[PDB]
């Protein structure tokens, strides 16, 4: 008779069939294929700017807790996996609550201290339950048994509001909000954003599978209130097996620099670069924001050890199929447009002939450009000091725009002699486009001698 | 996309035909006297490949993305 209630309801669910890996299926926006070259004049840069289209598949397991979502979060929880569970706001199902085995991984936890049973668990029951558990913990083991943090950190180049969302969860869309995004600066190639998620675990509260799917509600349910409760084949429902306890936060990184490498610079802060981050701004939320970067590293630092005062609050939760008890795992797929922004700055070249003999220089380099109908074309330039005498005193400086590469350069010295009139001094190609750059001479026509300085 | 294309360097090639996939731009060169027109890469397009495959010392070019702008007319000598 029990044990009729327990096959039975045992029986609709594994008769309940579906695909695990697609029903957790979602796609926020499918663009063309499509990619755009656009190179700018600005001043002290030719910056090229070139959009193209870019495709994720983001598979995640740990989701993420929030004000919305926090109500509806405790280890044997049972959830409703949709539209709900996708947008991070997925639908507690109100059945009889059977009791369910918690464990939470503290260290120094012995015997059967490491474990707890929720006989009708209960957000309030059961928060109650690990927090106190916790409070047990933090007066005898937090005295000589620490803990750190499991760091787990995850950043991205922030392209669209579309594949943050697949990155970090639709859920994003609320919690980022006041933070201020501005995707026209970045897709302007004004802006360099970065966005990045940083999940300080210190404790996981973590269920036991139940014997049979009867396991996890207590006696008086039935097959038919599961089907009128909204509960079916085309809704199923999981259950959150595992909870994770700590600090997360989001940080924005929003950088004037137009590098290649800022990502690397945020990953290296923690775990050069220094000049790109003197000038960054930072705006983050915890679960301030301020033009420095020692605000991050303290608010890092400061939370890399367990608090003793109360227990954390839960930022990670994992579920699982109450069918098959397997892990459940989101995939997310979404067409966004990826923004690169290069800026190559300008340059200038000083020339300066103090030689008695009286020289002749050859400057050429390579031209980036476009061309009538805007096509882009590169093309050979040659100097029209070139072929020209220069004195004792002779001194002009030749601007150099962004556009401007692969400088090559020859230098002549004059010879007295009717043979070999003029006579090699120096002659190099592939000069990179410094800042600035002195060629100068001296000498005698038989001691000639010269300067290829880097300035900058 | 269609260049201007003559396998022997002539000081004036006619003869333009539709490019390969592989090629993305036209290249117009002039090396003294000898002139050459031909299919080109973008990423070819700098002096120590050019004249790594032009078999020529010294040199002024132009590479274009568009259809016959790789005509002799483009360089100042």
């Given at each position: 008779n029990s044990e009729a209630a327990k096959k039975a309801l045992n029986d609709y669910?594994?008769?309940?069939?579906?695909?695990?890996?697609?029903?957790?299926?979602?796609?926020?926006?499918?663009?063309?294929?499509?990619?755009?070259?656009?190179?700018?004049?600005?001043?002290?840069?030719?910056?090229?700017?070139?959009?193209?289209?870019?495709?994720?598949?983001?598979?995640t397991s740990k989701l993420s807790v929030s004000s919305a979502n926090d109500d509806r979060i405790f280890p044997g929880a049972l959830l409703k996996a949709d539209q709900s569970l996708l947008e991070?706001?997925?639908?507690?199902?109100?059945?009889?609550?059977?009791?369910?085995?918690?464990?939470?991984?503290?260290?120094?936890?012995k015997n059967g201290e490491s474990n707890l049973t929720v006989e009708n668990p209960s957000n309030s029951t059961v928060r109650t339950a690990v927090n106190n558990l916790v409070e047990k913990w933090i007066q005898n083991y937090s005295k000589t048994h620490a803990v750190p943090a499991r760091m787990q950190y995850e950043s991205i180049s922030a392209q669209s509001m579309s594949q943050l969302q697949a990155k970090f969860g639709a859920d994003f869309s609320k919690v980022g909000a006041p933070l201020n995004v501005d995707f026209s600066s970045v897709h302007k190639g004004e802006k360099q954003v970065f966005i990045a998620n940083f999940r300080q675990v210190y404790y996981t509260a973590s269920v036991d599978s139940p014997n049979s799917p009867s396991a996890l509600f207590?006696?008086?349910?039935?097959?038919?209130?599961?089907?009128?409760?909204?509960?079916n084949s085309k809704t199923?429902?999981?259950?959150?097996?595992?909870?994770?306890?700590?600090?997360?936060?989001?940080?924005?990184?929003?950088?004037?620099?137009?590098?290649?490498?800022?990502?690397?610079?945020?990953?290296?802060?923690?775990?050069?670069?220094?000049?790109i981050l003197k000038n960054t701004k930072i705006c983050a939320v915890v679960l301030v924001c301020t033009g420095?970067?020692?605000?991050?590293?303290?608010?890092?630092?400061?939370?890399?050890?367990?608090?003793?005062?109360?227990?954390?609050?839960?930022?990670?939760?994992?579920?699982?199929?109450?069918?098959?008890?397997?892990?459940?795992?989101?995939?997310?797929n979404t067409d966004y447009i990826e923004t690169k922004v290069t800026s190559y700055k300008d340059g200038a070249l000083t020339l300066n002939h103090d030689g008695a003999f009286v020289a002749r220089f050859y400057v050429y380099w390579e031209e980036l450009?476009?061309?009538?109908?805007?096509?882009?074309?590169?093309?050979?330039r040659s100097w029209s000091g070139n072929g020209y005498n220069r004195g004792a005193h002779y001194s002009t400086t030749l601007r150099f725009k962004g556009n401007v590469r692969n400088i090559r350069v020859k230098v002549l010295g004059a010879t007295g002699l009717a043979w070999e009139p003029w006579r090699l001094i120096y002659s190099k190609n592939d000069l990179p486009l410094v800042p600035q750059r002195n060629i100068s001479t001296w000498g005698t026509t038989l001691h000639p001698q010269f300067e290829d300085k880097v300035v900058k | 996309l269609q260049c201007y294309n003559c396998p022997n360097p002539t000081a004036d090639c006619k003869t333009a035909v539709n490019c390969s996939?592989?090629?993305?731009?036209?290249?117009?060169?002039?090396?003294?006297?000898?002139?050459?027109?031909?299919?080109?890469?973008?990423?070819?397009?700098?002096?120590?490949?050019?004249?790594?495959?032009?078999?020529?010392?010294?040199?002024?070019?132009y590479c274009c993305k568009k259809d016959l702008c790789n005509f002799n007319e483009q360089l100042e000598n």
């Open positions: 669910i594994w008769g309940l069939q579906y695909d695990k890996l697609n029903i957790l299926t979602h796609q926020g926006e499918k663009l063309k294929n499509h990619s755009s070259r656009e190179a700018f004049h600005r001043p002290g840069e030719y910056v090229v700017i070139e959009k193209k289209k870019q495709s994720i598949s983001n598979a991070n706001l997925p639908t507690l199902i109100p059945v009889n609550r059977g009791k369910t085995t918690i464990s939470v991984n503290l260290p120094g936890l207590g006696s008086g349910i039935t097959p038919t209130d599961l089907i009128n409760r909204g509960v199923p429902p999981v259950y959150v097996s595992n909870v994770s306890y700590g600090r997360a936060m989001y940080v924005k990184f929003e950088t004037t620099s137009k590098s290649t490498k800022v990502q690397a610079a945020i990953d290296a802060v923690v775990k050069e670069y220094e000049n420095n970067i020692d605000t991050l590293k303290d608010l890092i630092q400061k939370g890399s050890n367990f608090s003793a005062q109360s227990p954390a609050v839960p930022i990670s939760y994992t579920t699982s199929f109450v069918k098959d008890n397997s892990i459940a795992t989101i995939q997310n450009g476009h061309d009538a109908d805007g096509y882009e074309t590169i093309r050979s | 996939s592989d090629f993305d731009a036209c290249l117009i060169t002039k090396a003294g006297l000898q002139v050459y027109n031909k299919c080109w890469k973008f990423e070819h397009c700098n002096f120590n490949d050019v004249t790594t495959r032009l078999r020529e010392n010294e040199l002024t070019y």
